[PDB]
Write a protein that binds this ligand. Sequence first.
Ligand SMILES: *[PH](O)(O)OCCCOc1cccc2c(OCCCOP(=O)(O)OCCCOc3cccc4c(O)cccc34)cccc12
Ligand SMILES: *C[C@@](*)(O)[C@H](CCCNC(N)=[NH2+])NC(=O)[C@@H]1CCCN1C(=O)[C@H](N)Cc1ccccc1
Ligand SMILES: [K+]
Ligand code: NA
Lengths: 251, 32
Amino acid sequence: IVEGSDAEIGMSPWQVMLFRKSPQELLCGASLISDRWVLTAAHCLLYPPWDKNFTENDLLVRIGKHSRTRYERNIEKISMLEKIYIHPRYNWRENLDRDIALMKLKKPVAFSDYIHPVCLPDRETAASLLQAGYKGRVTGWGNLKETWTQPSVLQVVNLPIVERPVCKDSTRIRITDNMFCAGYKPDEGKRGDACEGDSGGPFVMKSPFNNRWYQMGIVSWGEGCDRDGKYGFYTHVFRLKKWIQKVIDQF
Amino acid sequence: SGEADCGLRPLFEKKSLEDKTERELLESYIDG
DNA sequence: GGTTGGTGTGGTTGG
Ligand SMILES: *[PH](O)(O)OCCCOc1cccc2c(OCCCOP(=O)(O)OCCCOc3cccc4c(O)cccc34)cccc12
Ligand SMILES: *C[C@@](*)(O)[C@H](CCCNC(N)=[NH2+])NC(=O)[C@@H]1CCCN1C(=O)[C@H](N)Cc1ccccc1
Ligand SMILES: [K+]
Ligand code: NA
């Protein structure tokens, strides 16, 4: 997260860490959507170009964390994966279209002040909230700056959605319906963005009807980090929601 | 197929408490 | 130290 700030304790209780078992390295973000299920970007698990093809036993998942490095004794709960489900039509070759992945946990996690699941949007909620100029929230442990130019605690930043016209003419990469960008325009004064090591991290908005939080986006890709004319791209969670239900009920 | 209690933070919503920069989110909805 | 930094009448937690 670039140009963000430290989260407050329990600000983002659905925030999840993908941790590499051997060696010990922070991989990606993710979000807890039930007591058994976790959502992340697919490119966190399967990106051949970087020689990434992880499986259940390569990764554990850490929930309730705030400090990036420390084992938060008595706060965080560590879980192992039962199964991974990368989206069938996930296009890693071209443009990361359909950059989404689910993970079932061996044993269900208990909820606490620091561990609580987020809500997935629906027809109406997506229609209402997911609109240009409307700000969402991004959280992650990723890099504070662009590669060629890491935080001690979870980083939060509030970022406004951007209209497809301005969203497509920003990049040379082919966009799909399963994406949306977000971030400040060069004149807008305020700035900020997700960065490397933020993928899987949720993009949430707070329903002003029922004061619940909804995960509208997954951190997918970028082109550097927080540079004028460039916007971070997010996996459109709802337009894939049909897939998410399928996977849960079948397994 | 939303979970019974999801999206409500124990240390915030569940205590009618607001986080440092959530008002910014609401403002966006109004004059955005 | 620790499955873990920095500095405690802990802290988001023992001892
Ligand atoms: P439970 O109660 O069964 O067992 C827990 C008791 C163990 O207590 C501690 C063990 C190790 C470290 C600490 C501790 O670390 C703080 C480190 C930073 O403070 P400092 O470096 O300034 O040290 C304090 C200065 C005084 O030093 C000592 C005081 C008493 C005893 C000893 C000792 O035996 C060796 C060296 C220094 C000191 C904080 C609290 C408790 C424990
Ligand atoms: C995996 C995530 O940590 C990371 C998040 C990107 C954050 N960027 C910003 N500022 N929003 N994703 C990536 O690094 C992805 C995965 C594969 C390559 N990639 C990129 O961002 C490339 N720089 C762009 C790209 C290359 C190929 C296909 C699509 C996009
Ligand atoms: K300690
Ligand atoms: Na930008």
